[PDB]
Design a protein around this ligand. Structure first.
Ligand SMILES: CS(=O)(=O)c1cccc(-n2ccc(=O)c(-c3ccnn3-c3cccc4c3OC(F)(F)O4)n2)c1
Ligand SMILES: [Cl-]
Ligand SMILES: [Mg+2]
Ligand SMILES: [Zn+2]
Length: 313
């Protein structure tokens, strides 16, 4: 009960900021997550023995791929920690419990390939889940791990509180399917503009948690330039491997995934910042004013990619 996790001074202070990088020491990431759970939820919401076993099983079920890995899991959980900690009063007890777990689990057993490649490969997962293919898989792996002996971190919830938190986690993980982000942000934009946005409407909360999930998932574009630039290498290493596998199926991949079109990456980044990232953090800042630092950091990185194009780096 009285066993508080504590971080060294620089991490204790910088973990509270949106642009925090969890560092290269793999063995510190479990402790960084528990620290975050304890401060954003309480020391009481999870049994430490159960939580520690859950985290290490989640870790084991992330693969050794360049980007969609255990470090991405904990990074996305940290962005969610920063949002919850900057919006203390807006979220229920179950939401704070569900969302950090949802983030940690959101890419469980990711192979480094898009839903599109699974569909063109004719992977069994594409027959089992026709849309949001990997995202339904990620949720399935979350439930599987929750059901390992000694792993039910929610076992002290009632039947209905339990069904409510698994429902928060399912929607939250499904929302990380970027195909669903565009329509979701459009609706939130319209609801915000016409003043119909109502956080007491459960269907509106769902939408707002969806956009938070997109924002946490994309959060590599909200880091300091050196973190963002170096993460871009891991992201594109997966895209190019997928491009290679597309060519193996006799399909010319989109330029984003062609390692022969490596020259077009800077302009591809501008497109993504303008089409996806900036719109995402703008709508999020409108709904949750204190998440503005994510928008500001995003804009700073868009400017850094413009500088790359102009040969200024
Ligand atoms: C062709 S499209 O629809 O425009 C399209 C689709 C998917 C990613 C991208 N794309 C391009 C360039 C990029 O730097 C990123 C990026 C930045 C941060 N994270 N990710 C990202 C990477 C890999 C997978 C992901 C990603 O976020 C996700 F959670 F959405 O799933 N993403 C673009
Ligand atoms: Cl607090
Ligand atoms: Mg994903
Ligand atoms: Zn992700």
């Amino acid at each position: 009960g009285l066993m508080q996790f504590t971080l060294p001074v620089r991490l204790c202070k910088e973990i509270e900021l949106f642009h925090f990088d969890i560092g290269p020491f793999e063995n510190m990431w479990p402790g960084i997550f528990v620290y975050m759970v304890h401060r954003s939820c309480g020391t009481s919401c999870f049994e430490l023995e159960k939580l520690c076993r859950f985290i290490m099983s989640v870790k084991k079920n992330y693969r050794r791929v360049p980007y969609h890995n255990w470090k991405h899991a904990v990074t996305v959980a940290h962005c969610m920690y920063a949002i919850l900690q900057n919006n203390h009063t807006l979220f229920t007890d179950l939401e704070r419990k569900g969302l950090l777990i949802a983030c940690l689990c959101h890419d469980l057993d990711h192979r480094g390939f898009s839903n599109s490649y699974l569909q063109k490969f004719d992977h069994p997962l594409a027959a089992l889940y026709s849309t949001s293919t990997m995202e339904q898989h990620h949720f399935s792996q979350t439930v599987s791990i929750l059901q390992l002996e000694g792993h039910n971190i929610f076992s002290t919830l009632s039947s209905s509180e339990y069904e409510q938190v698994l429902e928060i986690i399912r929607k939250a993980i499904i929302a990380t399917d970027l195909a669903l982000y565009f329509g979701n942000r459009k609706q939130l934009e319209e609801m915000y503009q016409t003043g119909s946005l109502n956080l007491n409407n459960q269907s509106h909360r769902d939408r707002v948690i969806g956009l938070m999930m997109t924002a946490c998932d994309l959060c590599s574009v909200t880091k300091l330039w050196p973190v963002t630039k170096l993460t871009a290498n891991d992201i594109y290493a997966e895209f190019w491997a997928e491009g290679d596998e597309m060519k193996k199926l006799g399909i010319q991949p989109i330029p984003m995934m062609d390692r022969d079109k490596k020259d077009e990456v800077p302009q591809g980044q501008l497109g993504f910042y303008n089409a996806v990232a900036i719109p995402c953090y703008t709508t999020l800042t409108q709904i949750l004013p204190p998440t503005e630092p994510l928008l500001k950091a995003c804009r700073d990185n868009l400017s850094q990619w413009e500088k790359v194009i102009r040969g200024e780096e």
